[PDB]
Design an enzyme around this catalytic site. Structure first.
Site, mmCIF file in Angstrom:
data_model
loop_
_atom_site.group_PDB
_atom_site.id
_atom_site.type_symbol
_atom_site.label_atom_id
_atom_site.label_comp_id
_atom_site.label_asym_id
_atom_site.label_seq_id
_atom_site.Cartn_x
_atom_site.Cartn_y
_atom_site.Cartn_z
ATOM 1 N N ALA A 24 -5.253 7.459 8.427
ATOM 2 C CA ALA A 24 -3.910 7.623 8.963
ATOM 3 C C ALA A 24 -2.977 8.463 8.098
ATOM 4 C CB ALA A 24 -3.288 6.253 9.198
ATOM 5 N N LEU A 94 11.720 3.124 10.128
ATOM 6 C CA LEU A 94 11.660 3.911 8.906
ATOM 7 C C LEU A 94 12.199 3.154 7.697
ATOM 8 C CD1 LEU A 94 11.201 6.612 7.440
ATOM 9 C CD2 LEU A 94 13.535 7.244 8.112
ATOM 10 N N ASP A 138 -3.303 -7.560 3.142
ATOM 11 C CA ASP A 138 -3.287 -6.325 2.359
ATOM 12 C C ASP A 138 -1.988 -6.186 1.561
ATOM 13 O OD1 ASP A 138 -4.565 -4.062 1.403
ATOM 14 O OD2 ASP A 138 -3.986 -2.767 3.072
ATOM 15 N N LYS A 140 0.277 -5.675 -1.455
ATOM 16 C CA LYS A 140 0.212 -4.980 -2.733
ATOM 17 C C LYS A 140 1.408 -4.035 -2.766
ATOM 18 C CE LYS A 140 -2.955 -1.556 -0.753
ATOM 19 N NZ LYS A 140 -4.162 -0.737 -1.041
ATOM 20 N N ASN A 143 2.142 -1.348 -0.178
ATOM 21 C CA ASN A 143 2.421 -1.819 1.178
ATOM 22 C C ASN A 143 3.744 -2.568 1.270
ATOM 23 O OD1 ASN A 143 0.157 -0.674 2.302
ATOM 24 N ND2 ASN A 143 -1.113 -2.510 2.069
ATOM 25 N N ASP A 160 2.346 -1.783 6.650
ATOM 26 C CA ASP A 160 0.897 -1.709 6.809
ATOM 27 C C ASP A 160 0.212 -2.974 7.309
ATOM 28 O OD1 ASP A 160 -1.782 -1.170 6.764
ATOM 29 O OD2 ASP A 160 -1.927 -0.836 4.613
ATOM 30 N N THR A 179 -8.066 -4.151 -1.158
ATOM 31 C CA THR A 179 -8.146 -3.541 -2.488
ATOM 32 C C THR A 179 -8.577 -4.556 -3.543
ATOM 33 O OG1 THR A 179 -6.360 -1.989 -1.944
ATOM 34 C CG2 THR A 179 -6.864 -2.300 -4.280
HETATM 35 N N1 LIG Z 1 7.470 2.366 8.196
HETATM 36 C C1 LIG Z 1 7.236 3.193 7.173
HETATM 37 N N2 LIG Z 1 8.283 3.832 6.604
HETATM 38 C C2 LIG Z 1 8.046 4.653 5.574
HETATM 39 N N3 LIG Z 1 6.889 4.965 4.990
HETATM 40 C C3 LIG Z 1 5.873 4.317 5.581
HETATM 41 C C4 LIG Z 1 5.957 3.437 6.646
HETATM 42 N N4 LIG Z 1 4.701 2.960 6.988
HETATM 43 C C5 LIG Z 1 3.899 3.553 6.140
HETATM 44 N N5 LIG Z 1 4.542 4.388 5.258
HETATM 45 C C6 LIG Z 1 3.943 5.190 4.191
HETATM 46 O O1 LIG Z 1 2.677 5.639 4.651
HETATM 47 C C7 LIG Z 1 1.634 5.137 3.777
HETATM 48 C C8 LIG Z 1 0.419 4.802 4.605
HETATM 49 O O2 LIG Z 1 0.786 3.930 5.699
HETATM 50 P P1 LIG Z 1 -0.031 2.545 5.971
HETATM 51 O O3 LIG Z 1 0.552 1.931 7.191
HETATM 52 O O4 LIG Z 1 0.004 1.821 4.697
HETATM 53 O O5 LIG Z 1 -1.468 2.950 6.283
HETATM 54 P P2 LIG Z 1 -2.846 2.566 5.745
HETATM 55 O O6 LIG Z 1 -3.294 1.346 6.475
HETATM 56 O O7 LIG Z 1 -2.796 2.577 4.260
HETATM 57 N N6 LIG Z 1 -3.870 3.754 6.187
HETATM 58 P P3 LIG Z 1 -5.494 3.879 6.170
HETATM 59 O O8 LIG Z 1 -5.881 4.249 4.750
HETATM 60 O O9 LIG Z 1 -5.824 4.967 7.179
HETATM 61 O O10 LIG Z 1 -6.023 2.516 6.577
HETATM 62 C C9 LIG Z 1 2.274 3.961 3.056
HETATM 63 O O11 LIG Z 1 1.579 3.438 1.908
HETATM 64 C C10 LIG Z 1 3.722 4.400 2.896
HETATM 65 O O12 LIG Z 1 3.884 5.269 1.791
HETATM 66 MN MN LIG Z 2 -1.353 0.946 3.247
#
Ligand SMILES: Nc1ncnc2c1ncn2[C@@H]1O[C@H](COP(=O)(O)OP(=O)(O)NP(=O)(O)O)[C@@H](O)[C@H]1O
Ligand SMILES: [Mn+2]
Length: 280
Positions: A24, A94, A138, A140, A143, A160, A179
């Site tokens: 993602a 956001l 998850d 940490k 997140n 996340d 992790t």
């Molecule tokens: N609502 C949000 N607002 C701002 N930044 C965000 C937001 N959601 C996610 N992010 C940023 O995007 C990163 C990745 O999003 P996340 O939802 O943590 O996906 P993920 O599950 O780690 N992806 P994947 O490795 O594909 O499983 C985060 O660690 C943040 O830096």
């Molecule tokens: Mn994440």
């Protein structure tokens, strides 16, 4: 469930990339009809049933289903969901203050007050989730996001929900794994999982907040996992010499191997200190 299939670009304008994951990418966006800003998480879909690339429909729908149910100051909210042949796009609330991970990297170490300020919010968010029988799985620093990091006591939101699961039977048994540094012994040993796993992760986060050091971190993933399973950690004096015994007590009651003997989210909120993937 089927999602909106109109081109997301017809309703939103995207900008800065906020973050990324194995499957993602998240980008800041602006809804055209309101001018309001969001975080668009593009999740890559699997092209076939037997594939490693992308995320299965089942896993995407689970994250969406959980997100649709939550509404709390310390958790992110879901605005809309779009999809096309290659991705499912979650339009999320956001959080523009960056990752707690990056905040900690720039400050090294916090005071117990600064630590508890962050922790109390995290606990409130997890209390909400656990109340709905939702295990995050998850938790940490990467997140956890700050709304504004240029303030003395930053407010946070948990993000996340890619591994989040409903625990309606007290436990889930499906090799869920996060992790190494933050997973509980039951995750490492592939045993039934429940809300208790999150409490262990909270203990690890607290240890880090107070010392700037990870309790079980080894030189390799296998070493870390081995340390976690054996509950191989200690409060190094160089790092905790000026930390209160109550703070250590809090951590000690969370980093407990037997999930049943570990403090629950309600216990953590009443504790004297508070009370006012994984492979080679
Ligand atoms: N609502 C949000 N607002 C701002 N930044 C965000 C937001 N959601 C996610 N992010 C940023 O995007 C990163 C990745 O999003 P996340 O939802 O943590 O996906 P993920 O599950 O780690 N992806 P994947 O490795 O594909 O499983 C985060 O660690 C943040 O830096
Ligand atoms: Mn994440």
């Amino acid at each position: 469930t089927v999602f909106r299939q109109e081109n997301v670009d017809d309703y939103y304008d995207t900008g800065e990339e906020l973050g990324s994951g194995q499957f993602a990418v998240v980008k800041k966006c602006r809804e055209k009809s309101t001018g309001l800003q969001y975080a668009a998480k593009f999740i890559k879909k699997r092209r076939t049933k037997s594939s490693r690339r992308g995320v299965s429909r089942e896993d995407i729908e689970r994250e969406v289903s959980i997100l649709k149910e939550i509404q709390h100051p310390n958790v992110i909210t879901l605005h809309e969901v779009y999809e096309n042949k290659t991705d499912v796009i979650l339009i999320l609330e956001l959080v523009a203050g960056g990752e707690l991970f990056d905040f900690l990297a720039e400050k090294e170490s916090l005071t117990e007050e600064e630590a508890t300020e962050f922790l109390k919010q995290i606990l409130n968010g997890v209390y909400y989730l656990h109340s709905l029988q939702i295990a995050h799985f998850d938790l940490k620093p990467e997140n956890i996001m700050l709304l504004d990091r240029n303030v003395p006591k930053p407010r946070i939101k948990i993000i996340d929900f890619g591994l989040a699961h409903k625990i309606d039977f007290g436990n889930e048994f499906k090799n869920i794994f996060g992790t190494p540094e933050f997973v509980a012994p039951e995750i490492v040993n592939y045993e039934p999982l429940g809300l208790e796993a999150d409490m262990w992760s909270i203990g690890v986060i607290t240890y880090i907040l107070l010392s700037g050091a990870s309790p079980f971190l080894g030189d390799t993933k296998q070493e870390t996992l081995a340390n976690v399973s054996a509950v191989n950690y200690e409060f190094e004096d160089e790092y905790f010499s000026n930390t209160s015994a109550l703070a250590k007590d809090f951590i000690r009651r969370l980093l407990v191997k037997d999930p049943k003997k570990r403090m629950t989210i309600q216990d953590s909120l009443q504790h004297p200190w508070i009370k006012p993937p994984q492979f080679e």
